Amino acid sequence: IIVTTKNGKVRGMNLPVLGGTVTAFLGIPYAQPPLGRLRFKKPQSMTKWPDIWNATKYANSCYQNTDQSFPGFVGSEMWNPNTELSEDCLYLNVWIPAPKPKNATVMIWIYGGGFQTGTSSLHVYDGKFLSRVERVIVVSMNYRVGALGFLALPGNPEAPGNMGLFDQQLALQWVQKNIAAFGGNPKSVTLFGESAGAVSVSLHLLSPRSHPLFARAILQSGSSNAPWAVTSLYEARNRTLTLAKFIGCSRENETEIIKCLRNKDPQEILQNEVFVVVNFGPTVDGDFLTDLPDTLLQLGQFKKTQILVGVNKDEGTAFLVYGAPGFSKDNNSIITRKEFEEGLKIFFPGVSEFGKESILFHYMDWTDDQRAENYRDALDDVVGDYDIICPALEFTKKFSEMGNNAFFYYFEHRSSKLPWPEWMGVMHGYEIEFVFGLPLERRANYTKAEEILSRSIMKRWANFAKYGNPNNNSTRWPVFKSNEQKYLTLNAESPRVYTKLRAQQCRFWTLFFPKV
Ligand SMILES: *[C@@H]1O[C@H](CO[C@@H]2O[C@@H](C)[C@@H](O)[C@@H](O)[C@@H]2O)[C@@H](O[C@@H]2O[C@H](CO)[C@@H](O[C@@H]3O[C@H](CO)[C@@H](O)[C@H](O[C@H]4O[C@H](CO)[C@@H](O)[C@H](O)[C@@H]4O)[C@@H]3O)[C@H](O)[C@H]2NC(C)=O)[C@H](O)[C@H]1NC(C)=O
Numbered sequence: 001i002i003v004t005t006k007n008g009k010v011r012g013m014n015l016p017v018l019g020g021t022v023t024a025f026l027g028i029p030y031a032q033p034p035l036g037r038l039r040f041k042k043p044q045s046m047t048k049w050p051d052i053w054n055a056t057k058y059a060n061s062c063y064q065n066t067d068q069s070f071p072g073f074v075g076s077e078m079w080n081p082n083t084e085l086s087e088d089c090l091y092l093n094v095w096i097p098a099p100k101p102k103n104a105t106v107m108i109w110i111y112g113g114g115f116q117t118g119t120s121s122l123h124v125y126d127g128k129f130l131s132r133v134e135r136v137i138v139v140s141m142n143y144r145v146g147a148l149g150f151l152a153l154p155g156n157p158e159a160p161g162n163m164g165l166f167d168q169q170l171a172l173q174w175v176q177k178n179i180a181a182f183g184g185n186p187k188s189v190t191l192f193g194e195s196a197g198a199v200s201v202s203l204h205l206l207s208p209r210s211h212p213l214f215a216r217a218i219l220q221s222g223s224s225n226a227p228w229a230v231t232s233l234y235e236a237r238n239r240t241l242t243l244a245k246f247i248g249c250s251r252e253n254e255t256e257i258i259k260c261l262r263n264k265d266p267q268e269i270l271q272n273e274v275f276v277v278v279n280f281g282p283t284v285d286g287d288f289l290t291d292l293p294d295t296l297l298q299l300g301q302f303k304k305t306q307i308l309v310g311v312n313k314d315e316g317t318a319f320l321v322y323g324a325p326g327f328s329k330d331n332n333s334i335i336t337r338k339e340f341e342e343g344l345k346i347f348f349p350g351v352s353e354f355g356k357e358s359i360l361f362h363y364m365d366w367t368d369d370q371r372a373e374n375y376r377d378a379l380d381d382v383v384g385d386y387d388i389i390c391p392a393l394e395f396t397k398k399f400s401e402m403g404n405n406a407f408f409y410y411f412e413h414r415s416s417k418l419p420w421p422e423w424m425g426v427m428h429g430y431e432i433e434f435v436f437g438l439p440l441e442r443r444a445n446y447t448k449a450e451e452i453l454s455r456s457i458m459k460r461w462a463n464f465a466k467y468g469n470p471n472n473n474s475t476r477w478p479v480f481k482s483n484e485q486k487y488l489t490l491n492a493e494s495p496r497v498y499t500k501l502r503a504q505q506c507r508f509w510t511l512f513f514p515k516v
């Protein structure tokens with residue numbers, strides 16, 4: 001099982017997957033290690049090796065602070081890295097079906113994590129089931145996060161900004177030059193990702209030099225037009241200078257502020273990263289991204305192709321348990337009105353006190369919901385609608401006004417193995433295990449219905465990658481058009497077709513709230 005690339009030969013391994021076999025290549029380098037003078041710089045093309053690269057084990061994860069908000073709790077630690085942390089982390093993984101195909105569709109996964117955390121070696125990102133069941137080739141790459149991936153000085157090639165996004169772009173370039181040798185069709189590539197990875201996929205749609213590197217796109221719970229996605233270039237010069245003051249590298253000569261940072265330790269950078277305020281994420285760098293995503297969308301400046309977008313029913317709950325008063329994973333988080341208004345101050349830092357009164361009126365005082373859970377559920381809807389759902393709906397509507405086919409889903413199933421409490425519902429991030437087919441292993445002790453639901457989701461995802469349409473006697477997933485705006489619910493009982501998701505709420509965020 002040796003495949004010959006353009007930089008050398010790589011060895012793989014065969015995995016027993018669901019009574020069959022899947023060939024996996026874990027840890028193929030796609031760029032020179034960004035060590036020394038290459039730190040904070042854009043990735044350089046990988047050098048050649050005459051030997052055989054073994055690629056039989058998940059490579060290193062990029063340096064990142066780990067989540068320690070809930071010690072020992074699996075619901076938080078399942079997202080922490082599971083390999084050694086090092087700056088030498090620019091590697092990718094490939095999963096080829098067995099027997100080897102000849103022109104298989106390729107699906108490339110881009111993990112999320114607020115552009116500060118994440119790795120492709122997580123168990124929930126294991127592509128072997130998807131390659132087995134749907135006979136697609138699955139690719140995933142590690143890209144730099146935090147300051148080491150998004151430290152920005154305007155126009156300074158020592159730290160230009162969006163380095164982590166260029167890491168993804170170079171990994172897409174590797175697929176165009178090498179996936180044919182593995183049995184994949186370089187003209188049938190689909191990008192899919194979740195949260196910050198969905199922001200990444202939607203930024204590749206807005207980056208012209210990425211257009212020829214893929215065919216279609218899938219956005220799970222994220223889009224680059226979200227309020228938290230992209231900063232301006234001056235906003236990114238600040239924070240970069242603020243970090244320099246905290247770490248002790250303040251210079252009046254800018255290009256040598258980076259020479260001081262290149263000689264600090266990676267753990268030293270991570271400890272001062274958090275004191276700056278997404279502290280180091282995508283910016284309008286003028287190279288990868290030339291304008292704010294909302295401007296590029298209004299100008300029609302994006303790749304014209306099909307997209308598949310969707311959100312989960314309870315997007316906001318995961319946000320609230322990490323920094324909102326009254327919320328806890330150890331009780332029902334029944335909050336008072338005072339705690340509600342303090343939650344708005346956290347998630348709406350600059351808005352006025354009348355702006356917060358507008359939110360409270362449209363989500364609470366406009367109706368008669370006198371349940372004890374009113375303020376709690378409404379604050380989940382406020383954060384979910386403002387930060388995830390309504391931006392994703394606006395992204396899909398823009399692609400539809402221009403005449404591109406789009407498909408929208410509404411995930412409603414809560415995993416029977418969800419470790420978080422019940423008040424959090426269908427959380428941000430917990431559709432991924434159904435997309436990657438984890439309920440198919442009967443030893444994982446998912447319900448039989450969850451295995452069926454997972455096979456359905458994997459089929460719809462793979463159909464969209466292969467044919468540009470997720471759809472047969474099953475419930476048809478209609479096209480999302482700008483007028484009717486039909487979407488499909490994803491659940492274990494019976495998927496339903498509805499129209500205009502959260503329409504009243506999104507009309508408040510896009511038509512009325514900007515005016516207060
Ligand atoms: C759900 O849980 C949250 C989180 O609380 C934490 O988990 C709980 C399961 C429980 O173990 C808690 O003890 C634990 O902190 C609850 O929200 C927290 O509520 C507590 C009070 O119950 C708040 O702590 C208090 O805050 C005040 C500062 O504004 C201050 O007056 C208090 O200190 C005084 O009183 C204590 C006695 O409690 C005394 O020891 C001190 O010396 C002092 O006099 C006290 O620190 C937390 O700030 C709250 N947390 C947040 C994030 O807001 C929540 O109430 C609970 N909900 C339900 C419905 O049960």
Ligand SMILES: *[C@@H]1O[C@H](CO)[C@@H](O)[C@H](O)[C@H]1NC(C)=O
Nearest residue numbers: 011012013052053054055056
């Ligand atoms: C690569 O894998 C082969 C086959 O298992 C093994 O013989 C070899 O030792 C490995 N290479 C290294 C450097 O360990």
Ligand SMILES: *[C@@H]1O[C@H](CO)[C@@H](O)[C@H](O)[C@H]1NC(C)=O
Nearest residue numbers: 102103104180185186187188
């Ligand atoms: C794969 O399909 C593309 C069109 O999608 C075609 O141009 C190409 O020749 C095919 N390659 C192989 C190896 O079958």
Ligand SMILES: *[C@@H]1O[C@H](CO)[C@@H](O)[C@H](O)[C@H]1NC(C)=O
Nearest residue numbers: 237238239240241242243245
């Ligand atoms: C970043 O911006 C804040 C707000 O204007 C300012 O006070 C601070 O000095 C800036 N940080 C710099 C220039 O390092």
